[PDB]
Ligand binder design. Structure first.
Ligand SMILES: C[C@@H]1C[C@H]2[C@@H]3CCC4=CC(=O)C=C[C@]4(C)[C@@]3(F)[C@@H](O)C[C@]2(C)[C@@]1(O)C(=O)CO
Lengths: 10, 255
């Protein structure tokens, strides 16, 4: 659902 | 003539904000069409939002909030962050008279007054005029922009509520320090702090006008306005929260 944002934050 | 060196940090929040501030991006001939301009703006906006996510990760305390809080804060504040920085560039580069999206993408008075640009551009430029009116300094701006990241929250509160309040109050105090540094008297300091916090509160209303365009142009695929992946994902996730009344705007003043 929030893959790109989550990836960036990780 | 001076040797190369990185600027000297000091143990203050504003010094760190100055070093972590992303460089202004270039969009990389302006269209005579509102439809084409909007798509171009969105493509630039996706790149700016990625830069802002990286900036947020570096803000002292941010990364210590629950991951869900971090994602939510960025989803709820991205527009405010983008519009505020657009306001700053427009203020510094054009005295609030032209929309300065990027050094290579300035939207002039004629284009800002095309039929389908008029309303959105008036709202996008308003904050720049306020920055110009108040003669906001770079340090004040940096503190205010961080406060915007921390100004739109879930109605039910964040998972790391206590920490969030602590972080937010550090930046409110930091804004006070930036004003105090001007060397005005106590009364002037109180007045300016009230004015700048009023300006922050006013961002919620400008942003409501702009999110209405953003969501409608995103949802109506037939309008053929394009959005990059980053923005599409965020907007897709933000809409249901916004429309469900879940985005609570923190206000310093009544309202
Ligand atoms: C009026 C809205 C508000 C606009 C946004 C205002 C804030 C902003 C500042 C920038 O420096 C680059 C892009 C953005 C982030 C933006 F300009 C574009 O995304 C286009 C945008 C959503 C909008 O023009 C549209 O909805 C077009 O579809």
């Amino acid at each position: 659902e929030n893959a790109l944002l989550r990836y960036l934050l990780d | 003539m001076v040797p190369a060196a990185l600027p000297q940090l000091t143990p203050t929040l504003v010094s760190l904000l100055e070093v972590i501030e992303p460089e202004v991006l270039y969009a990389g001939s302006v269209p005579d069409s509102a439809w084409r301009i909007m798509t171009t703006l969105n493509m630039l906006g996706g790149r700016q939002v990625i830069a802002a996510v990286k900036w947020a990760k570096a803000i002292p305390g941010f990364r210590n909030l629950h991951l869900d809080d971090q994602m939510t804060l960025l989803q709820y504040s991205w527009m405010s962050l983008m519009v505020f920085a657009l306001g700053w560039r427009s203020y510094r580069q054009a005295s609030g008279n032209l929309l300065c999206f990027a050094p290579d993408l300035i939207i002039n008075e004629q284009r800002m007054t095309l039929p389908c640009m008029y309303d959105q551009c008036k709202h996008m430029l308003f904050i720049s005029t306020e920055l110009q009116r108040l003669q906001v300094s770079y340090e004040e701006y940096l503190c205010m922009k961080t406060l915007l990241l921390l100004s739109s929250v879930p109605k039910e509160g964040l998972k790391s509520q206590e920490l969030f309040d602590e972080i937010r109050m550090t930046y409110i105090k930091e804004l006070g320090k930036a004003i105090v540094k001007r060397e005005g008297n106590s009364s002037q300091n109180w007045q300016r702090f009230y004015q700048l916090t009023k300006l922050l509160d006013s961002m919620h209303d400008v942003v409501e006008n702009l999110l209405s365009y953003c969501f409608q142009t995103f949802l109506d695929k037939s309008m053929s306005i394009e959005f990059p992946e980053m923005l599409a994902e965020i907007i897709t996730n933000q809409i249901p929260k916004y429309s469900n009344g879940n985005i609570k705007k923190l206000l310093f003043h009544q309202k």
